[PDB]
């Protein structure tokens, strides 16, 4: 019925607000990115600091792992993405082509492609091996908040402050679907469900929503949190109970029962907006990170 997530570790060291935390697919590591221009690597279980990864010239808003937990891509205000080899710390490629801050990024499930969204209102698809831009999508009319690939990589989901979520054919770059509901709030986050049937989408009106994007229908609504200013990640938690996990601008982490949409827990301790959360791929471990007045990461376990 309900989770029992308790604070285990508080990770410190980013010198400015944290923007993103992500667990590696193999469950060994946690990567964080930050407005301090740095990427940091922590042990997923003991929170033990591993290394710092640097090279971006301005703050980073997102970081993402390749399927094999070997590479990272980061999206920065310096208008680049960078492909990092985690074990050697090398910047392998610097993807240039966006005309404004790069906000979000993800590998496809094969880690041969990267998708990015930017304040320049485009979605771009990059080749991992050459670091070149394969397509630019004129996706939105306002800044793009989130970009995600589906289970086979055949589709890409986009989110923007223009109020739309869009689905794209990865091979053609064609828009296959535009989702919006009865109000048009800025869409601040989007991602596919692990089975690839649904998109979970956040809007700046304090609302998360589960969509069946084929049927074009909102299935579930998750409310209770505070989310009007910032692009807060949300997650499907599947290692124990089937939850929805999201930060909040009231400094708490919210956990919903996915089916019944009830708040089943709130996690307390950050001293600022909880901007990013992440769910461990095989343990009941939640990572959370907060903004300028906190600068810490926290590992909770149930």
């Amino acid at each position: 019925v309900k989770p029992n997530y308790a604070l285990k570790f508080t990770l410190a060291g980013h010198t400015k607000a944290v923007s993103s935390v992500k667990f590696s697919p193999n469950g060994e590591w946690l990567a964080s990115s930050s407005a301090d221009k740095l990427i940091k690597i922590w042990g997923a279980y003991d929170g033990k600091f591993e290394k710092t990864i640097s090279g971006h010239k301005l703050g980073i808003s997102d970081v993402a792992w390749s399927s094999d937990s070997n590479l990272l891509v980061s999206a920065s205000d310096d208008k680049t993405l960078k492909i990092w080899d985690v074990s050697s710390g090398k910047c392998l490629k610097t993807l240039k082509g966006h005309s404004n801050y790069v906000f979000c990024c993800n590998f496809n499930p094969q880690s041969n492609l990267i998708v990015s969204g930017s304040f320049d209102e485009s979605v771009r698809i990059w080749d991992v091996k050459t670091g070149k831009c394969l397509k630019t999508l004129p996706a939105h009319s306002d800044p793009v908040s989130a970009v995600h690939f589906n289970r086979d990589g055949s589709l890409i989901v986009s989110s923007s402050y223009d109020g739309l979520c869009r689905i794209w054919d990865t091979a053609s770059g064609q828009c296959l679907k535009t989702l919006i509901d009865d109000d048009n709030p800025p869409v601040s986050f989007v991602k596919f469900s692990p089975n690839g049937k649904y998109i979970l989408a956040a809007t700046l009106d304090n609302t998360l929503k589960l969509w069946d994007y084929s049927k074009g229908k909102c299935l579930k609504t998750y409310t209770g949190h505070k989310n009007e200013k910032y692009c807060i990640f949300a997650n499907f938690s599947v290692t124990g109970g089937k939850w929805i996990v999201s930060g909040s601008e009231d400094n708490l982490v919210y956990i919903w029962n996915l089916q019944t949409k009830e708040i089943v827990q709130k996690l307390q301790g950050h001293t600022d907006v909880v901007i990013s959360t992440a769910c461990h791929p095989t343990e009941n471990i939640i990572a959370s990170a907060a903004l300028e007045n906190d600068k810490t990461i926290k590992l909770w376990k149930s």
Binding site: K16, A17, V18, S19, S20, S34, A35, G59, S61, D62, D77, Y101, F103, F119, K229, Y230, C231, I275, L291, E292
Partner: peptide
Amino acid sequence: MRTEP
């Protein structure tokens, strides 16, 4: 920019 309102 994610850390900014």
